[PDB]
Design a protein around this nucleic acid. Structure first.
Ligand SMILES: Cc1nnc(C(=O)NC(C)(C)c2nc(C(=O)NCc3ccc(F)cc3)c(O)c(=O)n2C)o1
Ligand SMILES: Cc1nnc(C(=O)NC(C)(C)c2nc(C(=O)NCc3ccc(F)cc3)c(O)c(=O)n2C)o1
Ligand SMILES: [Mg+2]
Ligand SMILES: [Mg+2]
Ligand SMILES: [Mg+2]
Ligand SMILES: [Mg+2]
Ligand SMILES: [Mg+2]
Ligand SMILES: [Mg+2]
Ligand SMILES: [N+]
Ligand SMILES: [N+]
Ligand SMILES: [Zn+2]
Ligand SMILES: [Zn+2]
Lengths: 368, 184, 368, 184
DNA sequence: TGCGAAATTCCATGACA
DNA sequence: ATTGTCATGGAATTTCGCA
DNA sequence: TGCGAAATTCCATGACA
DNA sequence: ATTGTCATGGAATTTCGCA
């Protein structure tokens, strides 16, 4: 404060104030003659308030805040004080966007077997067709084989009705779903435990986590659209057609249809493949086991030039999910309890609850 | 001659009438000839209409080259013939009064009638709800002749529901004197 | 058809059918023994129908269609016939996504002078504040200097009221706006002609074209949000504050505030810059003219590895703007009349009207 | 001594009452001392409240170091003093009965009164709508003393509305005998 | 005529419905 | 008949203070 | 043992609310 | 306590038919 500035005036040296400039008094304030002009050197006991005043004009970031201050003042290491304040501005921290991207996506292993893992999700509301508004899509992780059920609501009860019918064929080890009301209800939890089925949930607001089924939704909608061009949108009666159509369509990267992956032999549908006509069923299942293990699997892509990956103990912020108009897009800072994988973390939210959360719904808190 | 395969032939038949369960009276039974795999569909009648409705569900999963049946009214109607022709399915009939399936299928059809009978006694009206577990049972039952269950032959993997108890399947003495009580 | 296939059976050579394979008759159909197995060679008069049947199962693209056909058939240059059909499938052409990106964006020149060009746009609806729901934002292209007016509707009339007040200060050469009801009405056209103001419109559904003002909208909303944290959203009374705050904020890339760009001297606001205290106003305006011409200007970025740029006469399709559920996302093909610039084109739409359109709202029709 | 600048001093004053136009009676006049640039605001009264409302609009575009005025009630109120103090604006008063501006400002204030008078005759009630064009006129008027208009001094560029006709500004003989008819 | 550290510049990221 | 923009904060690069 | 052309593979693009 | 996916159609690369 006034101690430092005094020693300075009588020509002595203080660490931080370069010796080659002339420091004087004028109008009752300590000034210095810098290349850009004459600036006031405020006492250290005043500087926080100055930085705060400059910042608060428009809640500016580093450079835009500095440039204001620099108009009137100079002192050692100005930006350090600016950054100190930016890191303490609740309002900036929870309103500003991030400027660091997420780390590169994971490509989880393909389920080893049919029925190892189902991915389920709803599509809708669709235009009413026979009183139905939604479609339950169930996609076997290994094969891609898909089942379609029309519903009136994305409800637990309609989910249960459909899956009772599907699981007539086989019971899955795991069913993966997002956090829809339908899937997280305790009635649905019971229904699964009853059958030795383990429930797995996506992190919230991250449909990529259900990518297997989401992507299938795309094809389902795309084929429905084509079939309905120039007609009224009576989709109910096409669900079965679409199901069959898609389960028997080739994935050019794999060179197999989901049907083939599930059964190792085409049924009596158009253009059935015949290559195994002369093998026994047992010879056929043997070639199937081999085809199943050798399927193409993609790798994690390169990180973008400015991504971040979560560290235990880091201050990070969760995106507000459904932010009201003119309200912050981020929650208050919170801490990384566990790095589940490089794209998934548990955080303690200051309330504080444990939340499992995608890094896509996080930013690293700025300025530490 | 080419070896037998799943979807080569479906054997279909009705069972019933049964005691009403959720408004349903009959069960359409579909058994794949090669695997012995079974699908069951509840209907309200042994009609062509109910058959078509039910087979539409099944045939939206997989389509057989041939459907075999006796000469039931529902299966010999020209509507049912149209339906099959549309899907490129050859229809096949056993001569009247002489049902011929195959050893495997007959034995499977036998298991079905008996397993049903066993579970309908005690709760003759709750069968609709049990159809799913009935099928899982049937389809994860070990075949003496082949070393494998229908599940295994159909999908080429073990199942997550193995039915480790080759079950009694016979009527216990309690159910014998109380099955003669329900039919009184 | 049967002519060709006959010559072939008796062992003669036809262009396209390789001579080293054995071609025979069996079950009344011409077959061939290829490495993968025995395939039927249908007569040419049958092939269109085959390709069509395969394609129609799920309306598949090239490879997925080929793979079906290949199960049963072989003939010369199969994919050429497949592609022929894909190019003729109305349903595929108007439902499928594009897989070619737009060419790199243009960075139009900064308007030379204040008042050369205004960019205007509405923000809202916002939570009601004193019966007001919208904000008219007017941004001078050269300076960034911005004016804010609260309205009850994004209407022509409220637009006119506001601009009468703004143009008290100065009349602009050009006003650029998007295609909002407010700006395209004939009443607004009249109001502008009355003042010798030229109206310029963005292409439709392309807010990037109003990027100057859109981007300012961001800052306006961001500052409003920060100022309103923990209070009810009474924004009406902050508009003036925000206006002033932003017009006096530094752009770190430019090193100037919009105020400075407009007037060459700070007014009596906090942290006013003083560097020109000793110049005459005329000396000051002279340094301003020089600062105005030397401002940083960005360049067109590199094209992505798979972009397209429009060619006169090309078949292209316009995106459906507000497509109903389960309806195609693209209009029928149409032709490029004029390439206005590499990112803007006039098209004849088959009705056919002339439409001026951003390439971001176009895909090149596939398969020619 | 540092050279004079825009925003160094604003000279303010009221004109009126005038004939009601859209419910308005007065005009607050703001003239920048250095440039001669003029802003006009319609008010319903020469009150502190109306002044604050109007200056809030102006001072959200640019803030003067000093506001000069006579000793009008609206300008000497302690409310108006609070307002200025909040914005770091020094208030300045001409001694009572002795208005002192500057040559430039007086001449500008004269032009305003005369230009108004000229346009209010014929349409004494439509002035509200004409305020915008009145300002453009005033601000694109060539200054004999400086080689430049206020627009040019304020912004450092030519304007898109040059007022090429240095206008009559005097009352034509028709308006002289019909301005004495409106005040009858 | 070169070092350590501070200052400035660069620029990917994301958001304007 | 038209066309993206720019605050932001880590990192990369340049400049500064001193010798 | 090498050429032209066809076949196959690669992979950026975009869409699942 | 969890995690993107894959049809698509030009282009790039490989294979094929022939010699
Ligand atoms: C808790 C909690 N409550 N709600 C959510 C939540 O996720 N909400 C949204 C509205 C985002 C949502 N979205 C999709 C989806 O399909 N989105 C489209 C998409 C698909 C794939 C891809 F990569 C990107 C986008 C759903 O299926 C879904 O059920 N929901 C609820 O979490
Ligand atoms: C004809 C015709 N009818 N309607 C349109 C049209 O444009 N409609 C939408 C709803 C897209 C729209 N959007 C924005 C905007 O701000 N969007 C957010 C944004 C801003 C910048 C950026 F880079 C990306 C997105 C507007 O301002 C606006 O007035 N509209 C109407 O064209
Ligand atoms: Mg969902
Ligand atoms: Mg979804
Ligand atoms: Mg029978
Ligand atoms: Mg708009
Ligand atoms: Mg906009
Ligand atoms: Mg007065
Ligand atoms: N994994
Ligand atoms: N330009
Ligand atoms: Zn802040
Ligand atoms: Zn198609």
């Amino acid at each position: 404060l006034d101690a430092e500035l005094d020693q300075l005036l009588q020509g002595h040296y203080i660490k931080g104030y370069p010796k080659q400039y002339t420091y004087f008094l004028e109008d009752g304030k300590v000034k210095v003659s810098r290349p850009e002009g004459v600036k006031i050197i405020p006492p250290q006991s005043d500087r926080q308030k100055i930085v705060l005043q400059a910042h608060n004009l428009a809640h500016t970031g580093r450079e835009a805040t500095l440039l204001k201050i620099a108009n009137l003042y100079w002192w050692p290491n100005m930006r350090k004080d600016v950054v100190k304040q930016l890191g303490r501005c609740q309002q900036c921290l929870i309103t500003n966007a991030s400027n660091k991207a997420s780390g590169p996506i994971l490509r989880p292993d393909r389920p080893q077997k049919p029925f190892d893992k189902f991915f389920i999700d709803y599509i809708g509301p669709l235009p009413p067709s026979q009183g139905y508004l939604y479609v339950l899509v169930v996609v076997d992780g290994m094969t891609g084989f898909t089942w379609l059920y029309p519903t009136k609501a994305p409800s637990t009860s309609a989910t249960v009705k459909s899956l009772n019918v599907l699981t007539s064929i086989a019971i899955p080890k795991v069913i993966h779903s997002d956090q829809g009301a339908a899937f997280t209800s305790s009635t649905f939890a019971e229904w699964a435990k009853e059958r030795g089925i383990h429930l797995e949930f996506s992190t919230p607001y991250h449909p990529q986590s259900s990518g297997k089924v989401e992507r299938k939704n795309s094809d389902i909608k795309r084929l429905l659209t084509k079939l309905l061009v120039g007609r009224p949108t009576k989709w109910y009666d096409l669900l079965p057609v679409v199901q069959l159509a898609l389960n028997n369509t080739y994935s050019p990267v794999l060179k197999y249809t989901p049907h083939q992956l599930l059964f190792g032999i085409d049924s009596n549908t158009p253009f059935a493949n015949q290559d195994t006509l002369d093998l026994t069923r047992e010879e056929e299942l043997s070639l199937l086991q081999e085809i199943r293990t050798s399927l193409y699997h993609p790798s994690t892509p390169p990180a973008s030039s400015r991504s971040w990956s979560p560290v235990v103990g880091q201050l990070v912020q969760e995106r507000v999910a459904r932010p009201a108009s003119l309200r912050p897009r981020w929650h208050k800072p919170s801490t990384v309890l566990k790095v589940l994988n490089p794209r998934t973390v548990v955080i303690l939210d200051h309330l504080g609850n444990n939340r499992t959360v995608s890094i896509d719904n996080l930013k690293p808190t700025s300025h530490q | 001659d080419r070896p037998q395969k799943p979807f080569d032939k479906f054997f279909i038949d009705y069972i019933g009438p049964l005691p009403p369960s959720q408004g349903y009276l009959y069960v359409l039974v579909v058994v794949d000839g090669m695997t012995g795999f079974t699908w069951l569909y509840p209907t309200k009648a042994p009609s062509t209409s109910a058959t078509v409705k039910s087979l539409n569900v099944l045939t939206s999963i997989a389509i057989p080259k041939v459907i075999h049946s006796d000469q039931g009214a529902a299966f010999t109607s020209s509507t049912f013939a149209e339906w099959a022709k549309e899907r490129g399915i050859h229809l096949e009939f056993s001569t009247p009064y002489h049902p011929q399936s195959s050893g495997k299928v007959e034995r499977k059809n036998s298991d079905i009638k008996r397993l049903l009978t066993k579970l309908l006694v005690g709760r003759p009206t709750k069968w609709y709800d049990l159809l799913p577990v009935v099928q899982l049972a049937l389809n994860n039952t070990y075949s003496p002749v082949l070393k494998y269950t229908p599940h295994q032959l159909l999908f080429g993997i073990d199942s997550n529901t193995p039915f480790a108890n080759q079950d009694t399947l016979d009527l216990t003495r309690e159910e014998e004197l109380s099955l003669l009580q329900e039919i009184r």
